[PDB]
Design an enzyme around this catalytic site. Structure first.
Site, PDB file in Angstrom:
ATOM      1  N   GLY A  92       3.436   6.403  11.485  1.00 27.17           N
ATOM      2  CA  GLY A  92       4.438   5.878  10.604  1.00 27.17           C
ATOM      3  C   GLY A  92       5.156   4.627  10.982  1.00 27.17           C
ATOM      4  O   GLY A  92       6.310   4.548  10.717  1.00 27.17           O
TER       5      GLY A  92
ATOM      6  N   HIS B 128       0.806  -1.218   0.000  1.00 28.89           N
ATOM      7  CA  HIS B 128       0.000   0.000   0.000  1.00 28.89           C
ATOM      8  C   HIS B 128       0.845   1.277   0.000  1.00 28.89           C
ATOM      9  O   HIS B 128       0.277   2.372  -0.008  1.00 28.89           O
ATOM     10  CB  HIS B 128      -1.036  -0.008   1.154  1.00 28.89           C
ATOM     11  CG  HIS B 128      -0.473   0.087   2.548  1.00 28.89           C
ATOM     12  ND1 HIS B 128       0.168   1.211   3.032  1.00 28.89           N
ATOM     13  CD2 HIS B 128      -0.552  -0.772   3.599  1.00 28.89           C
ATOM     14  CE1 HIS B 128       0.510   1.017   4.297  1.00 28.89           C
ATOM     15  NE2 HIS B 128       0.085  -0.180   4.666  1.00 28.89           N
TER      16      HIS B 128
ATOM     17  N   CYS C 216       4.144   1.564   9.912  1.00 31.52           N
ATOM     18  CA  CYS C 216       3.812   0.625   8.866  1.00 31.52           C
ATOM     19  C   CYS C 216       5.040   0.081   8.262  1.00 31.52           C
ATOM     20  O   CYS C 216       5.918   0.789   8.009  1.00 31.52           O
ATOM     21  CB  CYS C 216       3.151   1.352   7.749  1.00 31.52           C
ATOM     22  SG  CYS C 216       1.492   0.964   7.501  1.00 31.52           S
TER      23      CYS C 216
END
Ligand SMILES: *c1cc(O)c2c(c1O)C(=O)C=C([C@@H](O)CC=C(C)C)C2=O
Lengths: 295, 291
Positions: B136, B39, B138
């Site tokens: 942040g 993503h 991910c």
């Protein structure tokens, strides 16, 4: 989640120190290996060691220092309080930016638990108000160190020396001075009654408000003295004006006055949590500092 | 009793920042490949299309200061594999593995390619992770270390509304019934990991806590009805077998410890604590206790 600091910078400094039949962990920074002086003790010396007498009888080659598969060569030694300092041939190429600092009860840090020079695990800690640590020590974790990491600079604040009869741990700063009234001798010494770190619970309640839980708030306030009279019946540390001042920013951010949060804690102690949770815990958590919460 | 995380140094040297357009997240650099959540190429998207339209100059990889040059890209399930010019000289010995609910691992939480902290997790029975992920995070990874060898088992993708986290293995297969799109998704109802509670009671016995021990035994069946009533995973013969070393070590048979557990659930700690808790821990595995 309570998190520990990434341990990589510390891992590259761990070594194994052996003197005679005793082996523990050492910290290799630049060209010095730091380790507990107890390494020079034999079975028969634990009760009443005379460290000056035991160290005068040693030479440089009595100390076997191993960094992984490499033997380091000791070229000098001295003692500073309860830490031995071993000068070696070689500055540690992996030495990070570092400093030694002495911490106070309520402060938090991470511990890299090691066995015979090899790191095994990492965990996050607080120095308890009775100057002990509720650690998880494997049998040979002596010489494992505690630290904080800020902007890639490591602060070494703790070195592990021994386990107390109640299961807790005692140790020194990296200048060899013990935290609390403990000594590197096998006597009967026990930790004082442990108390909850009040300023840390309040900081955490503020963290709960910032993340949206407000269930435990109430409409009362309290005086500082009244708060402390109540809290001390639950074995909570007295709250000082310095603690109040320290919580001021969080109070500002959340709109809840410090003594108002104090009244909420008084009630939480009176009622328990009635099957509820706060951040994710079912217990009043006291190992996150005001400084931690902002982060 | 402290839960411990694995030393994170070997993984720290693999963490990089990956940017595609306006989106920035973490990546895992091993050899000459950076692995990250697909993503990163998102603006219900079609990831087949979006990546054919991509070219190498669309990805900006940064290993601290150094920019790495993407010289190839490909997708494997929900992870993007960005081939880069240089091999990571800090690549540890490693394997990709897939874990099962109830198994534990360490997560190295990172912010924009930079490690921030490390903590020990369990995969919940509903396939989520009760973690603390910062902004942040991910692309942060979970791992076990065994003998200087890193077993990568998890990559973080998403926060669920309930606050828990969802991710894939390092081959991009999701753990749980989740998808990498902005649909509305929720964790299913979770349950307590029974075999881990039992292991933690064994650890308590090994640590000298014996009050909860009792004279009785139960049956697997009788227990699972109590278990089911309290939102506990059911116990299997496999679980019983798994716990045998501990049973042998302590002289407490699993179904006798089960009796202790039934009683704790029905009646409570009652002012007593076990290892320094008043709630029963379920994020220690039997293996964790043996070590
Ligand atoms: C490291 C390892 C150890 O086993 C010990 C020590 C260090 O530093 C130590 O300092 C003291 C003892 C011993 O006196 C046991 C402690 C008590 C009985 C309080 C170590 O064993």
């Amino acid at each position: 989640r309570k998190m520990a600091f990434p341990s990589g910078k510390v891992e590259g400094c761990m070594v194994q120190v052996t003197c005679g039949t005793t082996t523990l962990n050492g910290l290799w920074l630049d060209d010095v290996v730091y380790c507990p002086r107890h390494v020079i003790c034999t079975s028969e010396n634990m009760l009443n060691p005379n460290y000056e007498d035991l160290l005068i009888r040693k030479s440089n080659h009595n100390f076997l220092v191993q960094a992984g598969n490499v033997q380091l060569r000791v070229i000098g030694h001295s003692m500073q309080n309860c830490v031995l300092k071993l000068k070696v041939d070689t500055a540690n190429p992996k030495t990070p930016k570092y400093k030694f600092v002495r911490i106070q009860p309520g402060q938090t840090f991470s511990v890299l638990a090691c066995y015979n020079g090899s790191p095994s695990g990492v965990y996050q800690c607080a120095m308890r108000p009775n100057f002990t640590i509720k650690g998880s020590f494997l049998a040979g974790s002596c010489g494992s160190v505690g630290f904080n990491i800020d902007y890639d600079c490591v602060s070494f604040c703790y070195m592990h020396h021994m386990e107390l009869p109640t299961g807790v741990h005692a140790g020194t700063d990296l200048e060899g001075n013990f935290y609390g009234p403990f000594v590197d001798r096998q006597t009967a010494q026990a930790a004082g009654t442990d108390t909850t770190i009040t300023v840390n619970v309040l900081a955490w309640l503020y963290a709960a408000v910032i993340n949206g839980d407000r269930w435990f708030l109430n409409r009362f306030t309290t005086t500082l003295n009244d708060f402390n009279l109540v809290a001390m019946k639950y074995n909570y540390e007295p709250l000082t004006q310095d603690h109040v001042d320290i919580l001021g920013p969080l109070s500002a951010q959340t709109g809840i006055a410090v003594l108002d949060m104090c009244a909420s804690l008084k009630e939480l102690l009176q009622n328990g949590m009635n099957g509820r949770t706060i951040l994710g815990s079912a217990l009043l958590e006291d190992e996150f500092t005001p400084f931690d919460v902002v982060r």
